[PDB]
Design a protein around this ligand. Sequence first.
Ligand SMILES: Nc1ncnc2c1ncn2[C@@H]1O[C@H](COP(=O)(O)OP(=O)(O)OC[C@H]2O[C@@H](O)[C@H](O)[C@@H]2O)[C@@H](O)[C@H]1OP(=O)(O)O
Length: 292
Amino acid sequence: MKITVLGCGALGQLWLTALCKQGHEVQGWLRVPQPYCSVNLVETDGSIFNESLTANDPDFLATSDLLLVTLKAWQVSDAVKSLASTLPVTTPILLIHNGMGTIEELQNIQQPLLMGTTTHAARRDGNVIIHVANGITHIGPARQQDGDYSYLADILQTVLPDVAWHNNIRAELWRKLAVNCVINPLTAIWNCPNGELRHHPQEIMQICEEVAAVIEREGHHTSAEDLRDYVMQVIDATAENISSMLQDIRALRHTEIDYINGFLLRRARAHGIAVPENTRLFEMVKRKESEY
Ligand SMILES: Nc1ncnc2c1ncn2[C@@H]1O[C@H](COP(=O)(O)OP(=O)(O)OC[C@H]2O[C@@H](O)[C@H](O)[C@@H]2O)[C@@H](O)[C@H]1OP(=O)(O)O
């Protein structure tokens, strides 16, 4: 299959590598055009894939069977809209990122729009990407109009196992969002590893009470206790890690906060829910951001 991968960062190079290894015809797409896309990825078995791949070829884009989008949330919707007039109107667009609210920005996309999440881990070390952990990728329809593109899960399962189609991808994304609304801003504000959050059960539960209220009203049934329990399992699993948001703060990069607690705020507003703690996290990270 012919794929354009938008984003040639860690996740993009993971997908580009896996795709090349199965003989799919690929290119990269870079927001800041460069003559080619550098892929330099060390697999779980220590093998190296180091390859310069085509980038930003509009004819390749125009005949691609899939646009696979691996940008950070705040980069996604502008980049996708800028390509959508070139991409054939039947060609699916699959977004994989953390955070939510890009779909709300892509309502007028005429292409099938899909969203995805994965538990693969790919970490940048220098100019090298390391495939740290294998995992599971779930994809499904982004909006109610988007139909059955499960064939894409069947193809991608042979590229980067495991992949499954989930019509209720949106419920899964909300549950991930709930965890992200806790771990990311608290770690970024407190400049601590994820496991330190254990010591703030009151603040966690309060964030979870707020998120559960919003999720409930969005039509997905959940509990503050269920979200808290999932937050603690994720914290337990990543106790020593430095969060992506804290890494962003430490490196003086723009964060994903507008698509994490920011998105929660926009959805809370729309349902008349008061979210005082999420608001504080959001404003605090925004303050930290505009010191650099
Ligand atoms: N397992 C996953 N499941 C669903 N989404 C994932 C997963 N892993 C990452 N992503 C997301 O894809 C988007 C792109 O992530 P990367 O490929 O890591 O971005 P990029 O490579 O541009 O940035 C990575 C290097 O350059 C810095 O921007 C960053 O801190 C890192 O050292 C973000 O929303 C990234 O999420 P986040 O910003 O790392 O929380």
